[PDB]
Amino acid sequence: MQNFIPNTDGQFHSFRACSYAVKDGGNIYRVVQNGDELNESLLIDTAI
Amino acid sequence: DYFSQANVFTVKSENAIVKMLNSNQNMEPTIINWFLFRICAIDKTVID
């Protein structure tokens, strides 16, 4: 149940990640990208 | 004198506009540093 938003669709060529959002009378909340804190940007490292 | 007698505005510390916009680091870094250099301290004796 957890995984429903697909992460990619194959080719890194015409992907354009999901663009749904909620509108609340002017105010807008996206779902894939919101610069509000509490969403720790991941520091992944090649060294694995 | 007449105005400040009614204490319409008292001042709290730690301006929220700089509390937020500080700890989420997911936006263009001039909004920083610029809002960061504009927000001066405030003591009502200037407000009034």
3-state SS, one letter per residue, for B10-41: CCCCCCHHHHCCCCCCCCCCCHHHHHHHHCCC
- Contact residues of B toward A, CB < 8 A: 20, 23-27
Rounded distance, CA B1 to CA B28, Å?
44
Would the CB atoms of B25 and A36 count as touching at under 8 Å?
A: no
Tell the residue number behind the tokens 């400040």, with chain if given: B4
Contacts of A19 (CB under 8 A, 6+ apart): A30, A32
Rounded to a whole number of angstroms, the CA Rg of chain A reads 14
Phi, psi dihedrals of residue B17, rounded to the nearest 5°: -60, -25
Q: What's the reported resolution, in angstroms, to a tenth?
A: 3.9
Nearest to B44 by CA among B16, B15, B8: B8
Rounded distance, CA A31 to CA B11, Å?
36
CA dihedral B34, B36, B38, B42 (to 10 degrees): 170
